[PDB]
Design an enzyme around this catalytic site. Structure first.
Site, short mmCIF file in Angstrom:
data_model
loop_
_atom_site.label_atom_id
_atom_site.label_comp_id
_atom_site.label_asym_id
_atom_site.label_seq_id
_atom_site.Cartn_x
_atom_site.Cartn_y
_atom_site.Cartn_z
CG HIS A 61 34.30 -31.04 -86.12
ND1 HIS A 61 34.20 -30.05 -85.17
CD2 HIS A 61 35.58 -31.04 -86.54
CE1 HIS A 61 35.39 -29.47 -85.02
NE2 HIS A 61 36.25 -30.06 -85.84
CG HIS A 91 26.23 -35.75 -84.22
ND1 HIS A 91 26.08 -35.67 -82.86
CD2 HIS A 91 27.18 -36.69 -84.45
CE1 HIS A 91 26.90 -36.56 -82.30
NE2 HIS A 91 27.58 -37.20 -83.25
CG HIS A 93 29.89 -39.73 -86.99
ND1 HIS A 93 30.90 -38.86 -86.67
CD2 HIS A 93 29.07 -39.81 -85.91
CE1 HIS A 93 30.71 -38.45 -85.42
NE2 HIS A 93 29.61 -39.02 -84.94
CD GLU A 103 32.12 -41.77 -85.07
OE1 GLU A 103 31.45 -41.63 -84.03
OE2 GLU A 103 33.04 -40.99 -85.39
CG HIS A 116 26.49 -40.87 -82.70
ND1 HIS A 116 27.82 -40.54 -82.88
CD2 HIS A 116 26.37 -42.19 -82.96
CE1 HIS A 116 28.48 -41.64 -83.17
NE2 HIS A 116 27.63 -42.66 -83.23
CB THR A 195 33.21 -40.90 -81.52
OG1 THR A 195 32.29 -40.04 -82.16
CG2 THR A 195 32.54 -42.10 -80.88
ZN LIG Z 1 28.79 -38.76 -83.06
#
Ligand SMILES: [Zn+2]
Length: 257
Positions: A61, A91, A93, A103, A116, A195
């Site tokens: 992910h 990590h 996004h 996000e 994050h 999230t």
């Molecule tokens: Zn995250």
């Protein structure tokens, strides 16, 4: 299982995780005009001098850079927090295009990516217990825009070839997360959630106002990762972001005027 595709993406997650429609879901849009300046908010204390990174993992992910969290080596305190929170992993996004990927949004603006840094409250003993508590986690969110390179990110970018597919990990020691921070620690804060599934409502979000800049080549390397495992059809790891969720009965506070 859940993911980011047409048939298993964010709009489907509530079927397995009904808290997806809950009262304190993340991310949110940060309306900068409605956020309340709170003069009682303290400066953030980021103490990362003794951080021990260990490993980088493609979990299907995102990729997580993991830290030794068995001692107070890399901790976040202050700000809106009333305890000591230990860094467990960071990590990102990111998008398929520079115009999306974050996000959180700021006055509806989407940034190219979002970092994050995930920390857990030591009063709960471990991460797995912390996620079961409303003040269990503190996540520092940092926006990425595309411009000049971030020198402190390059060591991450260069290892991604070794963890292209889901389930691959690589040794990743001596990485200094201070190299990922912007100059200012001015921030917004609000109560929210993970999230990704299980979407638990356990997070004090601390979103920095100042983005970092990364180069087009750096984000291009994020987009070469795969959601799939080795030996499966290739699915580029892109658009691994959950969209903004309803703010409901929450106030976003600002540490700055
Ligand atoms: Zn995250």
């Amino acid at each position: 299982h859940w993911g980011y595709g047409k048939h298993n993406g964010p709009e489907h997650w509530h079927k397995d995780f009904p808290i997806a429609k809950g009262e304190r879901q993340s991310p949110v849009d940060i309306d900068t005009h409605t956020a309340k300046y709170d003069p009682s908010l303290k400066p953030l204390s980021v103490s990362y001098d003794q951080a021990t990174s260990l490993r980088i993992l493609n979990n299907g992910h995102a990729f997580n850079v993991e830290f030794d969290d068995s001692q107070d080596k890399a901790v976040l305190k202050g700000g809106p927090l009333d305890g000591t929170y230990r860094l467990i992993q960071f990590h990102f996004h990111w998008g398929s295009l520079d115009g999306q990927g974050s996000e959180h949004t700021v006055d509806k603006k989407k940034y190219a990516a979002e970092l994050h840094l995930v920390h857990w409250n030591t009063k709960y003993g471990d991460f797995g217990k912390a996620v079961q508590q409303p003040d269990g986690l503190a996540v520092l969110g940092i926006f990425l825009k595309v411009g000049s390179a971030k020198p402190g990110l390059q060591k991450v970018v260069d290892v991604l070839d070794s963890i292209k597919t889901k389930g691959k990990s690589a040794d990743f020691t001596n990485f200094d997360p201070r190299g990922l921070l912007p100059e200012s620690l001015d921030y917004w804060t609000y109560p929210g959630s993970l999230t990704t599934p299980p979407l638990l409502e356990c997070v004090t979000w601390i979103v920095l106002k100042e983005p970092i800049s990364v180069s087009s080549e750096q984000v291009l390397k994020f987009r070469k990762l795969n959601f799939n495992g080795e030996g499966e059809p290739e699915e580029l790891m892109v658009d691994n972001w959950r969209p903004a969720q309803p703010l409901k009965n929450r106030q976003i506070k600002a540490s700055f005027k």
